[PDB]
Design an enzyme around this catalytic site. Structure first.
Site, mmCIF file in Angstrom:
data_model
loop_
_atom_site.group_PDB
_atom_site.id
_atom_site.type_symbol
_atom_site.label_atom_id
_atom_site.label_comp_id
_atom_site.label_asym_id
_atom_site.label_seq_id
_atom_site.Cartn_x
_atom_site.Cartn_y
_atom_site.Cartn_z
ATOM 1 N N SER C 371 1.772 13.680 22.786
ATOM 2 C CA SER C 371 2.730 14.594 22.199
ATOM 3 C C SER C 371 2.034 15.900 21.890
ATOM 4 C CB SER C 371 3.358 14.030 20.940
ATOM 5 O OG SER C 371 4.199 15.001 20.359
ATOM 6 N N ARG C 372 2.792 16.984 21.966
ATOM 7 C CA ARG C 372 2.205 18.311 21.999
ATOM 8 C C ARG C 372 2.210 18.988 20.643
ATOM 9 N NH1 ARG C 372 4.757 20.398 27.779
ATOM 10 N NH2 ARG C 372 4.641 18.338 28.779
#
Ligand SMILES: Nc1ncnc2c1ncn2[C@@H]1O[C@H](COP(=O)(O)OP(=O)(O)OP(=O)(O)O)[C@@H](O)[C@H]1O
Lengths: 58, 50, 506
Positions: C371-372
């Site tokens: 996840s960013r």
């Protein structure tokens, strides 16, 4: 209780719960037997405690 | 509470087939004739209003 | 009794009142109905994407306008709309009822409730095609969405306003992650603070009727239906309903977004929405693109998922967070559809089939799921005691194919191999038991610092519930510390290490 428009039982089982509202009591019945077990335990404990205190200095 | 909601659903489906009975009651009438007058006066009310 | 007939007679007064003002600057004949779409002559003052109503109850959206005739797509089976009927125009761009009164209800794509609990107490109507909020009233995400799963909040955290993708395969445990997250939000939906509550809108597209029935039954067993909104577009119903229903549910989400509250939405699953969209664009002669999804199918998931972010303080600090679900084909991440949802959402939770085939449920592939903007919005405690855990599972994944040779090795790879197997068996979880972050911290904490290494591998599943009940009975104050503070100081850390090594010792 105001949910059921055709109520007829909610006061009945309400009274049934308030009947059994003194539900059932527990037991701290042990005041004769539990003192006997701690008596044997404390006896063996003090014997061992004084014995090893003697045997260390010996 | 669940059974109360089920009984309400049964009352509604009984009145649904009663609505079918009311359709059968309405469609045999000379309201088929008398109701053309209702549309006539209603179009008088609508189209005059602008 | 006759009380709904009373209400329906009041509605008859509305219908009779509407008949006194019914002059439909619109009506036109249905020239031809074909390919599941209708061509209408007349309607010389209609709008683009205006809702119309045919003379059999099937509504419709007028999606294209030509000099001469107007093309209206249907909203149901075309069995009802007959040639030569009468087409009143309603007057609206396609809207749905939004507001808090939908909580508990099960509607389809046009706000018609199908639960059987009366009409929708509707706090207003809102468009389906809303422009997404521009780059200025956005704030980068800084609040956790505690999913309650162990591995999700360990490795791939979710922020309020962070569009995360749950991608996977068929019957591989995709829906269970979203369902466990909705059931985890019971921790705050029973509570009192609004800014910690988190409303769940589950949007079933393309699924069976009975699956959505069982899912409503599940969300009423565990009491989620005081905050759930089900938008069902089941596969019996025809294609533009499925093209529409996630958008109307995104309008439902934006109602909670603009009004300060926080809300989670789950699209499930958009690989059937793109099925419905390629059906609607291969019945209007629009030519297909790669793998016969039509050329704008990137734009569809774009304009869907971009109505979900974190509003800043200027608009009221509300939010909307989306979990689309993508059904791939056999572990593929490179068809044309799953390389468009990935290029929108802020990360993946790739639920690989092979790990569920070994029963490790949920089957998050750790080395792929990333996840960013998750890392800036995790709970502070997990970020303190799992900053090794992603790198440690990367380390264990490095020696995954190196240990299959069966060769005798050094001490360090055996140590990491035992700790990696204990962590892989550790992140399992049964259905409908999300663990709050106050209990996710000590289990991961026991996993990181080598305390598990004396235990055999089969006892770990009951070690989880045993160590949890050990902390629930005795060190309850540590759980309250992790609940309140959300952070492990040095004294908290030392007390936690003592409380581990106590129960680890037996
Ligand atoms: N933690 C769990 N405990 C028990 N069973 C699980 C768990 N996770 C997944 N399953 C099993 O996975 C099966 C399918 O779940 P799920 O619906 O998430 O898969 P899916 O791929 O989403 O299916 P569909 O795509 O048709 O919705 C269920 O039968 C469920 O029993």
């Amino acid at each position: 209780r105001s949910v059921l428009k055709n109520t007829s039982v909610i006061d009945k089982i309400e009274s049934y719960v308030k009947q059994y509202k003194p539900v059932k009591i527990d037991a701290s019945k042990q005041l004769q037997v539990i003192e006997s077990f701690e008596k044997h335990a404390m006896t063996n404990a003090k014997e061992t405690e004084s014995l090893v205190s003697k045997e260390l200095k010996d | 509470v669940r059974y109360e909601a089920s009984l309400r659903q049964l009352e509604q489906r009984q009145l649904a087939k009663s609505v079918i009975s009311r359709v059968q009651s309405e469609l045999g009438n000379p309201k088929f004739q008398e109701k053309v007058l209702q549309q006539s006066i209603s179009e008088i009310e609508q189209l005059l209003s602008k | 009794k006759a009380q709904p007939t009373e209400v329906s007679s009041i509605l008859e007064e509305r219908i009779k009142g509407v008949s006194d003002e019914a002059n439909l600057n619109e009506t036109g004949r249905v020239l031809a109905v074909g390919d599941g779409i209708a061509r209408v002559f007349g309607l010389n003052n209609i709008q683009a994407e205006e809702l119309v109503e045919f003379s059999s109850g099937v509504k419709g959206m007028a999606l294209n306008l030509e000099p001469g005739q107007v093309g209206i797509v249907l909203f149901g089976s075309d069995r009802l709309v007959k040639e030569g009927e009468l087409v009143k125009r309603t007057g609206n761009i396609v809207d749905v009822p939004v507001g808090p009164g939908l909580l508990g209800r099960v509607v389809d794509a046009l706000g018609n409730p199908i639960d059987g609990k009366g009409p929708i107490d509707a706090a207003g109507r809102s468009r389906a095609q809303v422009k997404a909020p521009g780059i200025l009233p956005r704030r980068s995400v800084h609040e956790p969405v505690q999913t309650g799963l162990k591995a999700v909040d360990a490795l791939v955290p979710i922020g309020r306003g962070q569009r995360e993708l749950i991608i996977g395969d068929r019957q591989t445990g995709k829906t269970a992650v979203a369902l466990d997250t909705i059931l985890n939000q019971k921790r705050w939906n029973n509570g009192s603070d609004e800014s910690k509550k988190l409303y769940c809108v589950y949007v079933a597209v393309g699924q069976k009727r009975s699956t959505v029935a069982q899912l409503v039954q599940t969300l009423e067993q565990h009491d989620a239906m005081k905050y759930s909104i089900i938008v069902a577009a089941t596969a019996s119903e025809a294609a533009p309903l499925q093209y529409l229903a996630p958008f109307t549910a995104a309008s439902i989400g934006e109602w909670f977004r603009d009004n300060g509250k926080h809300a989670l939405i789950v699209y499930d699953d958009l690989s059937k929405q793109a099925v419905a969209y390629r059906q609607l664009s291969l019945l209007l002669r629009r030519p297909p693109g790669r793998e016969a999804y039509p050329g704008d199918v990137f734009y569809l998931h774009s304009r869907l998922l971009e109505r979900a972010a974190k509003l800043s303080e200027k608009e009221g600090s509300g939010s909307l967070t989306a979990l689309p679900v993508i059904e791939t084909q056999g572990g593929d991440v490179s068809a044309y559809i799953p390389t468009n949802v990935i290029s929108i959402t802020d990360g993946q939770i790739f639920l690989e089939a092979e790990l569920f085939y070994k029963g490790i449920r949920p089957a998050i592939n750790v080395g792929l799921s990333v996840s960013r903007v998750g890392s800036a919005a995790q709970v502070k405690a997990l970020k303190q005691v799992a900053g090794s855990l992603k790198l440690f599972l990367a380390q264990y994944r490095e020696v995954a194919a190196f240990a299959q040779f069966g060769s005798d090795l050094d001490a360090s790879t055996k140590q990491t191999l035992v700790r990696g197997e204990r962590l892989t068996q550790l992140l399992k979880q049964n259905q409908y038991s999300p663990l709050a972050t106050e209990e996710q911290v000590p289990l991961i904490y026991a996993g990181v610092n080598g305390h598990l290494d004396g235990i055999e591998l089969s006892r770990i599943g009951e070690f989880e519930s045993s160590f949890l009940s050990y902390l629930k009975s005795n060190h309850n104050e540590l759980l309250t510390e992790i609940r309140e503070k959300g952070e492990l100081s040095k004294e908290l850390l030392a007390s936690l290490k003592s409380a581990t090594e106590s129960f680890v010792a037996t």
